[model samples]
Target: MNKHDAIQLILGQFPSAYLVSTCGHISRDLYNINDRARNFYMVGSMGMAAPVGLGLSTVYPDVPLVVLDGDGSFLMNMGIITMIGHQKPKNFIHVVLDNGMHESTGGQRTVPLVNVTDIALQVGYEYAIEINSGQKSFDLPNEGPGLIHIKVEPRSEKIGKRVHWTPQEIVQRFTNELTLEN
Candidate 1:
């Protein structure tokens, strides 16, 4: 399955959750999947999705959270992997989409090492699953912060071309989903 399909499947299984995406394309996908889920799209920031997700998970322990992150972004903030592993938030799930290239910015190579799963395992995230194909959902052990490393082929064509929503609109929709009206 492709990245979009995999993400859609995950969203179908777990609804009404907060999701953060690294780049614009992923953010657009999250928006399309469920407008109700709180989406924090890191438009310019490349590698801070995990930390942001962790903060959200800490504050709202009752809600389930997911981070749709890219390999490049993860590499940029590799420290977050260990931090998340250390915290071990049961409500948080991180799905790293590894296409080996930065599809958002001119298709540059991120990391030659394709061992994110092993790294996650070493870091001690109670549950770590690697998905290349035939994967549905990750099994987070009892009281676990799940980490899923998904390997997908980069789309030759651009996926999200018409993302017109401004940052204000995005934030407003997310806050509305969180019921934080002001």
Candidate 2:
């Protein structure tokens, strides 16, 4: 399955969970998947999604959070993996869509060319799974942090002709879904 398919599968399985994605196809898909899903589209920021998700996960341990990340973005903030692994937040799940190209920035190649799944494992995440095309989903650990590396095609489909929501709207919905109290 591709990134879009994987996202659809996740949305189908967990309707109420918050989904954050880096700007590009992932964010587009999240926006198109109905407004109630609560998306934090990281516009103009490439590698900040995981850290933002980490902060949210740390603040609200009861709420389930997922980040639809890209390989390039993940590589940009690879050090955060060590921090996330050390924290061991049960409410967080990071799904890295490894297409091996910076599809958002004119299809440039990312550096290191290393296996992100192995890197994630090496970084000390207790539950890490790598799923290429045609593979079934592996069960995540019942009580620990996790990462899923999904291999996908380099091309991504456009979601819509134009953006429908503003950044504030997106953030408000996302925060509201968390049910955060002052």
Candidate 3:
């Protein structure tokens, strides 16, 4: 199992969760997997997925919000994790797909010994767990400020077509979806 497979596993279980996918290949992968109005595909933002999801969850506290990120971006925006952790919103779930390198930007390496889930726990997240690449059947967190770190390989292949929506289009569609749901 790789990063793409991990995404499939994590996203497959929750059809209704509002998804905010990290930039680069993950966003493309998610578009290929499940393109929907509720899925916010980051066009070119690094490390902003969680913050966007956090802000959305802050406004829509009663809805399930999931932020999908990479180790590269996750580490870059560590402060957002602290903000979400401190807020303790019961509807936010953060998932990090750690692949040990930045495959999007020409296969550069990322920082080692990074433990996002542990940090989430230290910051007071309600649930923080780590799952191995091939580990299946783990319970998905369904409550607020939850976090799950999943191990993945650093290989960016099978990247489908880039998201076609303009930035404004993405946000407008997402806002519409949320309004309807609300």
Highest lDDT, which number?
Answer: 3
TM-scores for the candidates: 0.86, 0.87, 0.93
Shift of residue 166 alpha carbon in model 3, Å: 1.9
lDDT by residue for model 3 (98-134), tens: 8788877777888974666677889979888888757
Model 1 misses residue 144 by how many Å?
2.1
Model 3 sits at a Cα RMSD from the real structure of 1.5
Poorest stretch of ten by lDDT in candidate 2: 154-163
- Give model 2's clash tally: 0
Model 3 is weakest, by summed lDDT over 10 consecutive residues, at 135-144
Please provide the root mean square deviation of candidate 2 (C-alpha atoms, Å): 2.3
lDDT for model 3 comes to 0.82
What stretches of model 3 exceed 4 Å from their correct place?
none
lDDT of 1 by residue, 1-182 (tens): 56677778767756667788887467666656555536677677778888889998887777788888878877888898788888878888888877788776777887764666777878867777788677756555545588778787776434654446687887787778777622
Which of the two candidates, 1 or 2, achieves a greater TM-score against the reference?
Answer: 2
**Model 2 per-residue lDDT tens digits across residues 1-182:** 67667777667655666777887766766666555536678775878889889898899877778888888888887789889988888878888888888876688887744666677777677677777687654545665577877777865576443447788887777777666533
Tell me the lDDT of model 2 at 60. Answer: 80
RMSD each, Å: 2.6, 2.3, 1.5
